Design a protein around this nucleic acid. Structure first.
Lengths: 219, 79, 111, 316, 260, 183, 100, 108, 33, 95, 78, 75
RNA sequence: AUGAUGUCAUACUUAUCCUGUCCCUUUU
RNA sequence: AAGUGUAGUAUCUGUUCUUAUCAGUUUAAUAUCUGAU
C-alpha cells in the first residue's frame, strides 16, 4: 500500500491506536530519535532521546528504545518506553484535529534494564528484565502534576535535552519475582556445616550480581 | 539498451528458489555470506543463544538485536 | 549410559510478555514466555503477590508472543510463534486449567 | 579483564595454597584483540583471608584456563598448553604443547591425562608423561562442539555442554593406546546426546539428597537446574522407552514441534529419556492415562509410582 | 477374522493357490493378496509361509514380482521377525541375481514396515548390507540404498549410530553414479542418514566436495549440500567450520568465539 | 591466471593433502582450507577412474554369503540345505531363535566415520603398529616357543638393531610379559 | 513420483482444505509413494480446489472417496511440511492408454 | 596399433620429471608413478630431499628446499627451557635459560 | 511363545521390586543415622 | 544505455507524448495500428515504470533497430519532461 | 645390498605373517613371496627390499635365525 | 508358463553346461550373481547364449598365444 | 591390455500401468 | 508349449585415430571438436 523511507535505521515500532480512540500511525524508534509518521498526508514529527545530565557514559554510544507499552484508556492514551539506560520515559501523543501535533516526552521514572513491560489494569506495571529478578510496581502518579519538565517535539534544540534522573517518584515496588537467571557457575556441596548440600550458584549481570546459596526447602 | 539478457526461465528447470539453497558456481564469497547470514539469523532466533552471546558484553538484549540486524548488509565485504 | 532428564527448577527468565483478560473474566492475566516454557500469572490486586497460576512446558522455542481478541468478545486468545513452521492459536481453559489448542496451521519447514 | 581463576598448592612450595588468577589487557569482542596476558599470583594467606599478588608472570595470547597437574599449573595460552612451575618471578614454563586447534576453552585435570576442550573443536584427551615431561594428544572427538563447560565423568568418560545448546558425553574405548610416542589417529565415540533446550554452562553431577544415587546436576543460562540420573535397570529403561513412545503421540506439545525434533535440534539424541515429557502422565487426561496404561500393560497409578520412584531415588 | 475353521493343510493349500493370484494385471489384487498372505501367516505359522514364499523363482521381474518380498515383510510384521530374519539371510546365499535382489528388497520392505522394532536387528542386518554394497550389479546397489533409507527412517532415536556409520561407509561411494534409479535411491538414503545419522556427520562427509574443481564432482556435491540445507537450516550454523579471514573479507564469526 | 602447484603447496598450511587437479580449480585456497579440516572426509578415487566404480570385480570368484555365528549357531542353514536336498516341517525351536536374536546377539566390527570404501578394499589388510616385540600368536606358535623370543639374544651379540633405536629389549635393557616381547 | 518421475508437483502455499484420494489409489502415500505407516494429514492448496477442481484425487487425479494422509517416512524426514503436492501435470501416463 | 587405447588410457601425454632425474613420462599416471618411484627416490636421496606427502609431486628443485625448510619443524621441538631457578632474587628474579641452568649446576 | 517371556518378565519385575524394597529399607536406615 | 536511469511517468503529462509516439510508430511500423499505440500508452501507465520491459516489448513489436530508435526517442524526452518544472519538454513549447 | 632373500619355509607362511616376523627384527619395506598360480601354494622363498642397506644387513646378520613352519628361515644378501 | 519358464531356464543351463564340458572351455565361469564370465575374453554374459557366443568375436586365443610363447621360448 | 561409437537382440528397477473419457468445445 | 503398455539402466556381436605441428572452445587435466603449415 505505502512505502516511506526514514532518515536512519530503526529498532522498534509502536502502533498508535486509531479509529474512535486516538489517531492512526506508527511511532518508530531509532538511534537517538523517535519519529511519528502516520499514514495519509500527516507529517513526520521527530523527538530525540534524552540523556543523563553529566552522564559518565560514552558520547559515541547512542540510545535505543529497549521496550515500550501503551496504556489505552477511553479518555486518552500514553506510552511508557524504557531506554538503554533503563530510564522509563512517558511518551504522550499531542494530536491535532486530524493530524499529529507533537510528541510530548517526560521522565517517568528510573527502572532496571527492561526486557518487557506490561501496563495492566488496576494500576500495575510488570517490568521483566533481561537479567535478575522480575519487577511489579504500582502505578501511583500519572506522570503529570509534578515539577518534572515535559520535552515536546515542538520544543527546538541545537543539542539534546539533558535528563534529571531521580528515584521512583511515580511508582512503588509491590513485589519482586526472584527467578534466579544467568547462573554463570554452580557448586553443589555441603559448604555449610549441615548434611543437606547447598547449591552455591552465581547469577547476575554486573550490578545485579547474586551468589544464591540455594537450599532445598521452604522459607 | 542492446543487452539481450532475459534471464527468467527456460524449460521449468530445477531453479532453486530457496534462499541459500546453494549451487555449483557458488563462489567462496557467496558461501561465506550465506553462512554469516544464517548464523546471524540463528543467533537472533535462539533465546538462550542470544542470552549467552549478549551476556559477554554489558549491552542489553536490544543492543545485540540492533547490532545483529545492522550486520546483515555486507557482513564479509564488497565482492 | 541411559540417562533420565529431571528438571528441578523451571526457567524463571521472561523472554516474551503479554497482558490481557485471557481468563475470560474481569481479572487481567499476564502471559509470560520463557525460553522453553509458558506461564500464566494472576497477581493479587489487593495483596500485590504474583502467583504462578499455570506453568506448561512448550517443548519448543517460543520466538514470538502476540495476543488476540475477536470483535465483540471478552476472552483473549494466545498466538504462539515457535521455531517450527506451525502457527498456533491457543485459548485458556480455567475449568480444566489447561491450555487448549484452538487452531494450528502449518506454514513451512522446521528450524 | 579477568577470564579464569583457581586456587591450589605448589609442589615446590609447602602448604601455601596460592590463588592463580588470569586476566587479559586490551581485549575486544571484535576479532582484532590480544595485546597481552597476565597471571597475577595471589598469596591468599593469614588463615585463608589475605590475598597478595606477589608474582605477575605475563601470558602470550588470551588466557582462559588454569588448573593443577602433578603439582604444576596447567594453563591455556590461546592454542598452547603450558605446564608451568611456580618460580620466584613467574611460573617457569616447565613444559609446552602446541597441538591445540583454536583456543583453550576448558581444561579438566585427570589423575594422569587432561581433557582439553577447544572453542571450535571438541574435547581431546592428552597424556602428560612426567618422566619425559611431554604432553601428547592421546585421541580426539569425531563431531565438534562449542564447549562452554565440562566435567570428568570417569577415568575415560567426559561430559561437555555446547554453546549451541547441547550436552554430550564421550567415553573412551578400552583399546585407547594411552602410551604414545581424519585429523588424529585415535578417535572416540559419542555415548550420550540430548538437547538441553537452554544453554547449559555448569555440570558437577555428584550426590544431591543424602541417601540417593549420585547424578549430574546441570545449570542453564535461563535459570534452570536439572538433574540427569542413570537407569539402573534394563526393564526400567524399556518401561521408560514405552512411556515416551506413547506420550509422543498421546499428549504432544502445543507448539507443534515433535519430541524427536525438539530433542535432536543441534545433534541427534543418544540414550536420553526426556522425563519432562514423561511428567505429563500425571497431568494427562483420563482417556490418555487409560490408553497409556493399556499400551504399557500396567496401571496409571503404577506409572505414577514408577515415575515417583526415580525422583525419590535420584533427587530430593 | 475367523482364522480357525481353516485347517493347517487347508491354509497351506490356500497359500499355494494364492501364490498364483499374484500374476494379475491389477494392483489392488496384489495388495489384497499380500494382506491375505499376512493373515494366513498369522493364523498357521511363519515357517510354512516363509518356505512357500522362498520358492519364488521370479520368472518375470515385473507383474508383482517383488510382491513376494512385500508378503515376506507383511509376514514379518504379523509374525516374529526373529524367525523371518535368518531364513531370509540364508535364502540370500543363493547364486541367482534375481533371488539376491529379491532378498534385498524384502529386507528393505521389512525394515520399513517394522520401524521401531528394528532397534535389535541393526547389528544383525549390518554385514549383509555391507557385503551387498559391493556394486557387482546396479540393482544390488539400488536395493542397498533403499534398505539404508528404510533403516535410517526406522531407526530414528533408537540408538543405531554405529550401524548408520557402518552403512554410510559403503553408501558414500555410491554418490558417483549415473543410474536414475540408483541416483534417486542414493539421494533418498542421504536424506534418511541426515535425518538419523544427523546433519553434522553429513556435512563432515560432504565438506570437501563443495569447492571441488571438477564439473561433475562439484555438481554431485552441490546436490548433496542443497539436500542437506533444504532441511536442518538451523543446525548448519555450528557445522559451518571456521574459515580464515581474507584481506577484503572477514568470514570468521568472532561472536561465536565470545568466551563468557 | 592459474597458480602453480608448487606455489599452492608453499602457501598452504597442510600441503600434504594437495592434488594435481586442484591447481585449475576456481578457489584453490578454499579447497586447501577445507581439505585440512579435522573430521573432513575426502572425495573417492572415482574422480579420475573410468570403470564406473563397479567394473572392478570382473573375475573375483566370491563366496555366496558368510553368515554370522548368531545365525550359524541357530541351524537355519543346515535346515535350508536339508530342505533343498529333499526338494531339489522341522520345527526346531522358537525360544531358541528368540534368545539368539536377543541374548546371543554379537556386535560386529563397525567402521570409523571416515571409512570411505575404495575400489577393491579387499587386498589392503593393514596393521596398526607392529612394534619390535609385538606380533601375532601364529608366529610364536609356528616357532613353538614356550611362555623372551630367540631373536632378542642376537641383539646382544650383534648389538642393538639399527632401525629401532628406541627399542627396549627384555632382560638386558628393559627389566617381557605374555606374548609381548618388546617395550 | 517413483512411478512417474516426469510429474510436476504444485508446491503451492498450504490452505485449510482437506483432500481425498481416488478409490483406485486408496491408501497410497502422496509423497513417499508407500502403502503403510501414515503420520499426518494431507493439506490442499487454495487454488488447488475451487469448484471443478474440488473433490479430485491428489495423486490419481480422479474423483476422491477416502481422505489421504502423508507417509510417516515423509513426516519424519521433514518432507510433509512442503508445498501443495497436487499433481498439476499429466503426461507419460494414461496418454495412449485411451487409444488401446 | 591400439590408438584408441593410447588416447583413452592416457598415453601420448608428455611429462618431464626433474625430481625423477629429469626423465620423461608418456602419461599422467606415468607422471604420478615417476614422481614416486625408485628412480625419483634415488634422485631425492642423492639430492638430500627426503620422502613425504607434500614433497611428493614436486618438480622444481628450488621449491623442494623451501618445503623441506618450512616443514623442518614449523613450530615444534621446544619442550621447555625456562627452568633455571635463579635463587639470587627468590622473590622477583628467576628468569634464566636451561643452558644457563646447566651452567650454574656445573660451575656454581 | 510370548507367554513364556511374560511369565519371566513378571518374575523379573517381582525380583526388581524386592530389590527396590531392600534398597529403600537401606536408604531409610542410612537416613536414620 | 539512456534507459538505465530511473524515471517517473507520474511527474509528466501523457497527451504531449501521445501523437509523437503515434507518428514514430506509423513511421517505423509503416501501417496504421491501434494495438501498438495502446500498448505503448498503457506501458507508461505505472507511477514508476521500467525501461527494460518497454524496450523488450518494442523489440517484440518493432524489428529491434526501430525498437532501439523508439527507446532512445522516448527515454530522453520523458526524462526532460520529468526534469521540467512545468512537466514537459522543449518541443511542447515550440508549437 | 638393501635387497635380501629368505627361504626355508612351508605353506604355513604367507605374506603378512612373514612381514610381521621381519618387522620384529627390522622394518620390511617391500616383501614379495611369489606363490605359483597353478597350484596355489607357498614356494618357501621370498625377496625383501628394506628401507635401506643398514636394516637389510642387520636383518641378514641377526634376523637370519627364525624358523617358519618349523624349518629354519635363513637370510642371504641380494 | 512361469514354472514352465523356470524349467526351460534350467534346461538351457544344462545344455550350456553340457556344451561347455564338451568343448572343455576354461573361460566359462559361473558368477556369484547367477551369471557367466569368460576369463579368456575377460567379459560378462547375462544369459547362457552370451557366454557360449564368446567364440566368434574377440578371438583372444591369439592374445593367449603370446603368453604361451612367453612361458616357453621353443615352438 | 580397461574405453569411445551406435542399427540390432537380452536381464533388470521403479509395490509403474487397462473401462479412461469428452462434466464441460457448443466460436459462425 | 501365449502376455499389454509407460520411462531408464548393462552386459553381448561388426567398424575407426602412429598425422608432424600452431591457435581457440572445452576438459580437473586429457580427450573430442573447430581454422592454418
Amino acid at each position: 500500500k505505502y512505502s516511506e523511507p526514514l532518515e536512519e535505521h530503526g529498532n522498534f515500532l509502536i502502533t498508535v491506536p486509531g479509529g474512535s480512540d486516538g489517531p492512526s500511525g506508527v511511532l518508530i524508534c531509532s538511534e537517538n530519535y523517535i519519529t511519528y509518521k502516520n499514514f495519509g498526508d500527516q507529517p513526520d514529527i521527530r523527538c530525540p532521546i534524552p540523556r543523563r545530565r553529566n552522564d559518565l557514559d560514552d558520547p559515541e554510544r547512542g540510545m535505543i528504545f529497549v521496550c515500550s507499552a501503551t496504556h489505552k484508556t477511553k479518555s486518552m492514551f500514553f506510552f511508557l518506553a524504557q531506554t538503554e539506560q533503563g530510564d522509563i520515559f512517558k511518551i504522550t501523543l499531542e494530536t491535532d484535529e486530524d493530524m499529529v501535533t507533537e510528541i510530548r516526552l517526560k521522565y517517568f521514572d528510573t527502572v532496571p534494564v527492561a526486557a518487557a513491560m506490561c501496563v495492566l489494569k488496576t494500576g500495575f506495571l510488570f517490568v521483566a528484565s533481561e537479567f535478575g529478578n522480575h519487577y511489579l510496581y504500582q502505578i501511583a502518579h500519572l506522570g503529570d502534576d509534578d515539577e518534572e519538565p515535559e520535552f515536546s517535539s515542538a520544543m527546538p534544540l541545537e543539542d539534546t535535552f539533558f535528563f534529571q534522573p531521580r528515584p521512583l517518584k511515580n511508582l512503588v515496588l509491590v513485589d519482586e519475582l526472584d527467578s534466579l537467571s544467568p547462573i554463570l557457575f554452580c557448586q553443589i556441596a555441603d559448604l555449610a556445616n549441615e548434611d543437606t548440600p547447598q547449591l552455591y550458584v552465581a547469577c547476575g549481570r554486573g550490578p545485579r550480581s547474586s551468589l544464591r546459596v540455594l537450599r532445598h526447602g521452604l522459607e | 539498451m542492446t543487452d539481450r539478457y532475459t534471464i527468467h526461465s527456460q524449460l521449468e528447470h530445477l531453479q532453486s528458489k530457496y534462499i541459500g539453497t546453494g549451487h555449483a558456481d557458488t563462489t567462496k564469497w557467496e558461501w561465506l555470506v550465506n553462512q554469516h547470514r544464517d548464523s546471524y539469523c540463528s543467533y537472533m532466533g535462539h533465546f538462550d543463544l542470544l542470552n549467552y552471546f549478549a551476556i559477554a558484553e554489558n549491552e542489553s538484549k536490544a543492543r545485540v538485536r540492533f547490532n545483529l540486524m545492522e550486520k546483515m548488509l555486507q557482513p564479509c565485504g564488497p565482492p | 549410559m541411559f540417562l533420565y532428564n529431571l528438571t528441578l527448577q523451571r526457567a524463571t527468565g521472561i523472554s516474551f510478555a503479554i497482558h490481557g483478560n485471557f481468563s475470560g473474566t474481569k481479572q487481567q492475566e499476564i502471559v509470560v514466555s520463557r525460553g522453553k516454557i509458558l506461564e500464566l500469572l494472576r497477581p493479587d490486586p489487593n495483596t500485590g503477590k504474583v502467583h504462578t497460576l499455570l506453568t506448561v512446558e512448550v517443548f519448543g522455542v517460543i520466538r514470538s508472543l502476540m495476543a488476540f481478541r475477536l470483535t465483540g468478545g471478552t476472552k483473549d486468545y494466545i498466538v504462539v510463534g515457535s521455531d517450527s513452521g506451525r502457527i498456533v492459536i491457543l485459548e485458556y481453559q480455567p475449568s480444566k486449567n489447561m491450555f487448549e489448542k484452538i487452531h494450528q496451521e502449518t506454514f513451512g519447514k522446521s528450524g | 579483564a579477568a577470564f579464569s581463576v583457581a586456587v591450589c598448592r605448589f609442589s615446590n612450595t609447602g602448604e601455601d595454597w596460592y590463588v592463580l588468577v588470569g586476566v587479559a589487557k586490551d581485549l575486544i569482542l571484535n576479532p582484532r584483540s590480544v595485546a597481552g596476558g597476565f597471571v597475577y599470583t595471589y598469596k591468599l594467606v593469614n588463615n585463608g583471608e589475605k590475598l597478595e599478588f606477589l608474582h605477575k608472570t605475563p601470558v602470550e595470547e588470551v588466557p582462559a584456563a588454569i588448573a593443577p597437574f602433578q603439582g604444576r599449573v596447567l594453563i591455556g595460552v590461546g592454542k598452547l598448553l603450558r605446564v608451568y612451575d611456580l618460580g620466584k618471578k613467574k611460573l617457569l614454563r616447565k613444559c609446552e604443547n602446541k597441538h591445540i586447534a583454536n583456543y583453550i576453552s576448558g581444561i579438566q585435570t585427570i589423575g594422569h591425562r587432561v581433557i582439553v576442550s577447544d572453542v571450535q573443536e571438541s574435547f581431546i584427551w592428552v597424556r602428560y608423561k612426567r618422566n619425559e615431561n611431554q604432553l601428547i594428544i592421546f585421541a580426539d572427538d569425531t563431531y565438534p562442539r562449542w564447549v562452554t563447560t565440562a566435567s570428568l565423568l570417569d577415568y575415560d568418560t567426559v561430559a561437555g555442554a555446547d554453546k549451541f545448546g547441547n550436552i554430550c558425553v564421550v567415553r573412551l574405548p578400552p583399546n585407547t593406546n594411552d602410551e604414545v610416542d581424519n585429523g588424529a589417529s585415535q578417535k572416540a565415540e559419542v555415548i550420550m546426546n540430548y538437547h538441553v533446550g537452554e544453554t547449559v554452562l555448569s555440570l558437577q553431577k555428584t550426590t544431591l539428597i543424602p541417601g540417593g544415587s549420585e547424578s549430574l546436576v546441570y545449570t542453564t543460562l535461563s535459570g534452570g537446574i536439572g538433574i540427569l540420573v542413570p537407569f539402573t535397570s534394563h526393564e526400567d529403561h524399556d518401561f521408560f522407552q514405552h512411556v515416551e513412545m506413547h506420550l509422543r503421540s498421546e499428549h504432544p506439545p502445543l507448539c507443534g514441534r515433535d519430541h524427536l525434533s525438539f530433542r535432536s535440534y543441534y545433534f541427534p539424541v543418544k540414550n536420553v529419556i526426556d522425563g519432562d515429557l514423561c511428567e505429563q502422565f500425571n497431568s494427562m487426561e483420563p482417556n490418555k492415562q487409560k490408553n497409556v496404561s493399556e499400551e504399557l500393560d500396567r496401571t496409571p497409578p503404577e506409572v505414577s509410582k514408577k515415575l515417583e520412584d526415580i525422583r525419590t531415588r535420584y533427587a530430593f | 477374522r475367523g482364522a480357525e475353521y481353516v485347517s493347517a493343510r487347508e491354509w497351506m493349500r490356500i497359500c499355494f493357490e494364492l501364490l498364483e493370484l499374484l500374476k494379475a494385471h491389477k494392483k489392488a489384487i496384489r495388495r489384497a493378496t499380500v494382506n491375505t498372505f499376512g493373515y494366513i501367516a498369522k493364523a498357521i505359522g511363519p515357517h510354512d509361509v516363509l518356505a512357500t514364499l522362498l520358492n519364488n523363482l521370479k520368472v518375470q521381474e515385473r507383474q508383482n514380482r517383488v510382491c513376494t518380498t512385500v508378503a515376506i515383510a507383511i509376514v514379518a510384521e504379523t509374525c516374529s521377525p526373529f524367525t523371518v530374519l535368518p531364513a531370509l539371510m540364508n535364502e540370500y546365499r543363493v547364486p541367482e541375481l534375481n533371488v539376491q535382489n529379491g532378498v534385498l528388497k524384502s529386507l528393505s520392505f521389512l525394515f520399513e514396515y517394522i520401524g521401531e522394532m528394528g532397534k535389535d536387528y541393526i547389528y544383525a542386518v549390518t554385514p549383509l548390507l555391507e557385503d551387498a554394497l559391493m556394486d557387482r550389479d546396479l540393482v544390488h546397489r539400488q536395493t542397498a540404498s533403499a534398505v539404508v533409507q528404510h533403516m535410517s527412517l526406522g531407526v530414528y532415536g533408537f540408538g543405531c549410530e554405529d550401524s548408520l556409520n557402518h552403512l554410510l561407509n559403503y553408501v558414500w561411494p555410491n554418490v558417483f553414479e549415473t543410474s536414475p534409479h540408483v541416483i534417486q535411491a542414493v539421494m533418498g538414503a542421504l536424506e534418511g542418514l541426515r535425518v538419523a545419522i544427523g546433519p553434522c556427520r553429513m556435512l563432515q562427509y560432504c565438506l570437501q566436495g563443495l569447492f571441488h574443481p571438477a564439473r561433475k564432482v562439484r555438481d554431485v556435491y552441490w546436490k548433496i549440500y542443497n539436500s542437506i540445507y533444504i532441511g536442518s537450516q538451523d543446525a548448519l550454523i555450528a557445522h559451518y567450520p571456521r574459515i580464515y579471514n581474507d584481506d577484503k573479507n572477514t568470514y570468521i564469526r568472532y561472536e561465536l568465539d565470545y568466551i563468557l | 591466471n592459474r597458480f602453480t602447484v608448487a606455489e599452492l603447496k608453499q602457501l598452504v598450511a597442510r600441503p600434504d593433502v594437495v592434488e594435481m587437479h586442484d591447481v585449475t580449480a576456481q578457489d584453490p585456497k578454499l579447497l586447501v582450507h577445507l581439505k585440512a579440516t579435522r573430521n573432513s572426509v575426502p572425495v573417492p578415487r572415482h574422480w579420475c577412474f573410468k570403470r564406473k566404480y563397479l567394473q572392478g570385480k570382473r573375475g573375483i570368484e566370491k563366496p555366496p554369503f558368510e553368515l554370522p555365528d548368531f545365525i550359524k549357531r541357530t541351524g537355519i542353514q543346515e535346515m535350508r540345505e536339508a530342505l533343498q536336498e529333499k526338494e531339489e516341517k522341522i520345527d526346531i525351536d522358537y525360544q531358541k531363535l528368540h534368545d539368539a536374536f536377543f541374548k546371543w546377539q554379537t556386535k560386529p566390527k563397525l567402521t570409523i566415520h571416515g571409512d570411505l570404501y575404495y575400489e577393491g578394499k579387499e587386498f589392503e589388510t593393514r596393521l596398526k603398529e607392529k612394534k619390535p616385540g609385538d606380533l601375532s600368536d601364529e608366529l610364536r606358535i609356528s616357532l613353538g616357543m614356550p611362555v623372551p623370543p630367540p631373536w632378542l639374544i642376537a641383539m646382544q651379540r650383534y648389538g642393538p638393531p639399527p632401525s629401532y633405536p628406541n627399542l627396549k629389549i627384555p632382560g638386558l635393557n628393559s627389566p617381557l610379559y605374555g606374548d609381548v616381547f618388546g617395550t | 513420483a517413483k512411478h512417474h518421475p516426469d510429474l510436476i508437483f504444485c508446491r503451492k502455499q498450504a490452505g485449510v482444505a482437506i483432500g481425498r484420494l481416488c478409490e483406485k489409489c486408496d491408501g497410497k502415500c502422496v509423497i513417499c509413494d508407500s502403502y503403510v505407516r501414515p503420520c499426518t494429514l494431507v493439506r490442499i492448496c487454495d487454488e488447488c480446489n475451487y469448484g471443478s477442481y474440488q473433490g479430485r484425487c491428489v495423486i490419481c487425479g480422479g474423483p476422491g472417496v477416502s481422505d489421504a494422509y502423508y507417509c510417516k517416512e515423509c513426516t519424519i524426514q521433514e518432507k510433509d511440511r512442503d508445498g501443495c503436492p497436487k499433481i498439476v501435470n499429466l503426461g507419460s501416463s494414461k496418454t495412449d492408454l485411451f487409444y488401446e | 596399433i591400439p590408438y584408441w587405447l593410447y588416447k583413452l588410457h592416457g598415453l601420448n601425454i608428455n611429462y618431464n620429471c626433474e625430481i625423477c632425474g629429469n626423465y620423461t613420462y608418456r602419461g599422467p599416471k606415468a607422471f604420478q608413478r615417476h614422481f614416486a618411484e625408485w628412480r625419483h627416490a634415488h634422485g631425492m636421496r642423492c639430492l638430500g630431499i627426503p620422502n613425504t606427502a607434500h614433497f611428493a609431486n614436486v618438480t622444481q628443485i628450488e621449491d623442494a628446499v623451501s618445503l623441506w625448510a618450512k616443514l623442518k619443524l614449523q613450530k615444534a621441538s621446544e619442550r621447555w627451557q625456562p627452568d633455571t631457578e635463579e635463587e639470587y632474587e627468590d622473590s622477583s628474579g628467576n628468569v634464566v635459560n636451561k643452558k644457563t641452568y646447566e651452567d650454574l649446576k656445573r660451575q656454581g | 511363545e510370548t507367554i513364556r517371556r511374560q511369565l519371566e518378565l513378571e518374575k523379573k519385575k517381582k525380583q526388581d521390586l524386592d530389590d527396590e524394597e531392600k534398597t529403600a529399607k537401606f536408604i531409610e536406615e542410612q537416613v536414620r543415622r | 544505455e539512456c534507459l538505465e536511469k530511473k524515471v517517473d511517468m507520474s511527474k509528466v503529462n501523457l497527451e504531449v507524448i501521445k501523437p509523437w509516439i503515434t507518428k514514430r510508430v506509423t513511421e517505423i511500423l509503416g501501417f496504421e495500428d491501434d494495438v501498438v499505440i495502446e500498448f505503448i500508452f498503457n506501458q507508461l501507465e505505472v507511477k514508476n515504470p521500467d525501461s527494460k520491459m518497454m524496450q523488450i516489448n518494442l523489440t517484440g513489436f518493432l524489428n529491434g533497430k526501430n525498437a532501439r530508435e523508439f527507446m532512445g526517442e522516448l527515454w530522453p524526452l520523458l526524462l526532460s519532461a520529468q526534469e521540467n518544472i512545468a512537466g514537459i519538454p522543449s518541443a511542447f513549447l515550440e508549437l | 645390498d638393501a635387497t635380501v632373500y629368505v627361504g626355508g619355509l612351508d605353506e604355513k607362511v604367507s605374506e603378512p605373517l612373514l612381514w610381521e616376523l621381519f618387522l620384529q627384527a627390522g622394518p620390511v619395506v617391500n616383501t614379495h613371496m611369489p606363490k605359483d598360480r597353478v597350484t596355489g601354494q607357498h614356494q618357501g622363498y621370498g625377496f625383501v627390499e628394506f628401507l635401506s642397506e643398514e636394516d637389510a644387513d642387520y636383518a641378514i646378520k641377526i634376523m637370519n635365525m627364525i624358523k617358519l613352519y618349523g624349518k629354519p628361515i635363513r637370510v642371504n644378501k641380494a | 508358463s512361469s514354472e514352465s519358464n523356470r524349467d526351460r531356464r534350467e534346461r538351457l543351463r544344462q545344455l550350456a553346461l553340457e556344451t561347455i564340458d564338451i568343448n572343455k572351455d576354461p573361460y566359462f565361469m559361473k558368477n556369484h550373481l547367477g551369471s557367466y564370465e569368460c576369463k579368456l575374453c575377460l567379459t560378462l554374459h547375462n544369459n547362457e547364449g552370451s557366454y557360449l557366443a564368446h567364440t566368434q568375436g574377440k578371438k583372444h586365443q591369439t592374445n593367449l598365444a603370446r603368453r604361451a610363447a612367453k612361458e616357453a621360448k621353443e615352438a
